[PDB]
Amino acid sequence: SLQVFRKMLTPRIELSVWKDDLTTHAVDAVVNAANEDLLHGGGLALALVKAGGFEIQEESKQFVARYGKVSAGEIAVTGAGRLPCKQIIHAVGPRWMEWDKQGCTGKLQRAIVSILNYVIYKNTHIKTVAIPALSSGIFQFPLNLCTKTIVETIRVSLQGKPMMSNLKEIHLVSNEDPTVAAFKAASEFILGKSE
Ligand SMILES: Nc1ncnc2c1ncn2[C@@H]1O[C@H](COP(=O)(O)OP(=O)(O)OC[C@H]2O[C@H](O)[C@H](O)[C@@H]2O)[C@@H](O)[C@H]1O
């Protein structure tokens, strides 16, 4: 695992960018890049189920059978099986559509806000969370726009906002060099140089 960028976002919360495998990255909560059915058939989603255990897939199915599909911009929280985290926050990013860039961007923003609301207000005991570049793989969201949107939404959601949570670290994580590089560049553009 390798940390390529870090910066205090607020006096309490540090943002960092990592090259790592989310299946072995130890944090309190890992964010999955899910679809609306929580059918974990490819990408990060499949990797999490394969490493954490099929129970993650069962809990996901039961969630949707009870509460309905998870719309883009929304979350569902499950257990994490054998993974080195306490929960999986399944976040549904938009599928990229060239004809609706503005709507897609908004859905990605909303997904980040939903993650942050869970961590800050619903489970105030989360100290660390790791977040992927939602929608930028299988969902084809352009990588630079994706990473910039994520970092800016995190910034604007937290800077100058009193809260009551134990959150100390947000990790932006990929196992692919170009995505790590895009997160690093977005972080530097929005927050300044690593410190
Ligand atoms: N093990 C991993 N560790 C770290 N980063 C990872 C890992 N696996 C993937 N990534 C990064 O994870 C990021 C997101 O990649 P994607 O998983 O394609 O998600 P999406 O939101 O675009 O597509 C969701 C759909 O794909 C699935 O079929 C779901 O079931 C949905 O149908 C990329 O930056 C990858 O580098």
Coordinates of N, CA, C and O in Angstrom, one line a residue, residues 3 5-16 154-155 158-159 167-170 187 190-195:
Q3 N 0.7 5.6 0.2 CA 0.0 6.9 0.2 C 0.8 7.9 -0.6 O 2.0 8.1 -0.4
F5 N -0.6 11.3 -1.3 CA -1.1 12.6 -1.0 C -1.7 12.6 0.3 O -2.5 11.6 0.6
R6 N -1.5 13.6 1.1 CA -2.3 13.8 2.3 C -2.4 15.3 2.6 O -1.5 16.1 2.4
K7 N -3.5 15.7 3.2 CA -3.7 17.1 3.6 C -4.9 17.2 4.6 O -5.9 16.5 4.5
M8 N -4.7 18.1 5.6 CA -5.8 18.3 6.5 C -6.9 19.1 5.7 O -6.7 20.2 5.2
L9 N -8.1 18.5 5.7 CA -9.3 19.2 5.1 C -9.9 20.2 6.1 O -10.4 21.2 5.7
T10 N -9.9 19.8 7.4 CA -10.4 20.6 8.5 C -9.4 20.3 9.6 O -8.5 19.4 9.4
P11 N -9.4 21.0 10.7 CA -8.5 20.7 11.8 C -8.6 19.3 12.3 O -7.7 18.8 12.9
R12 N -9.8 18.6 12.1 CA -10.0 17.3 12.6 C -9.8 16.2 11.5 O -9.6 15.0 11.9
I13 N -10.0 16.5 10.2 CA -10.2 15.5 9.2 C -9.1 15.6 8.2 O -8.9 16.7 7.6
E14 N -8.4 14.5 7.9 CA -7.3 14.4 6.9 C -7.8 13.6 5.7 O -8.4 12.6 5.8
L15 N -7.6 14.2 4.5 CA -7.8 13.6 3.3 C -6.5 13.0 2.7 O -5.5 13.7 2.8
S16 N -6.5 11.8 2.2 CA -5.4 11.1 1.7 C -5.7 10.3 0.4 O -6.9 10.0 0.2
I154 N -16.4 16.5 -1.3 CA -15.9 16.3 0.1 C -15.5 17.6 0.7 O -15.9 17.9 1.9
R155 N -14.8 18.4 0.0 CA -14.3 19.7 0.5 C -15.5 20.6 0.9 O -15.6 21.1 2.1
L158 N -17.5 19.6 4.1 CA -16.9 19.5 5.4 C -16.2 20.8 5.8 O -16.2 21.1 7.0
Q159 N -15.7 21.6 4.9 CA -14.9 22.8 5.3 C -15.9 23.8 6.0 O -16.9 24.1 5.4
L167 N -14.9 11.2 12.9 CA -14.2 11.0 11.7 C -12.9 11.7 11.7 O -12.8 12.9 12.0
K168 N -11.8 11.0 11.4 CA -10.4 11.5 11.4 C -9.8 11.4 10.0 O -8.9 12.2 9.7
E169 N -10.1 10.4 9.2 CA -9.4 10.2 7.9 C -10.4 9.7 6.8 O -11.2 8.8 7.1
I170 N -10.3 10.4 5.7 CA -10.9 9.9 4.4 C -9.8 9.5 3.5 O -9.0 10.4 3.1
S187 N -6.9 16.3 -5.9 CA -6.6 16.8 -4.6 C -5.7 18.0 -4.5 O -5.9 18.9 -3.8
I190 N -7.6 21.2 -5.9 CA -8.6 21.7 -5.0 C -8.1 22.1 -3.6 O -8.5 23.1 -3.1
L191 N -7.1 21.4 -3.1 CA -6.6 21.5 -1.7 C -5.2 22.1 -1.6 O -4.7 22.3 -0.5
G192 N -4.4 22.1 -2.7 CA -3.0 22.5 -2.7 C -2.1 21.3 -2.5 O -2.5 20.1 -2.5
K193 N -0.8 21.6 -2.3 CA 0.2 20.5 -2.3 C 0.1 19.6 -1.1 O -0.3 20.1 0.0
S194 N 0.6 18.4 -1.2 CA 0.5 17.4 -0.1 C 1.3 18.0 1.1 O 2.4 18.6 0.9
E195 N 0.8 17.8 2.3 CA 1.4 18.3 3.5 C 1.1 17.3 4.6 O 0.0 17.5 5.3

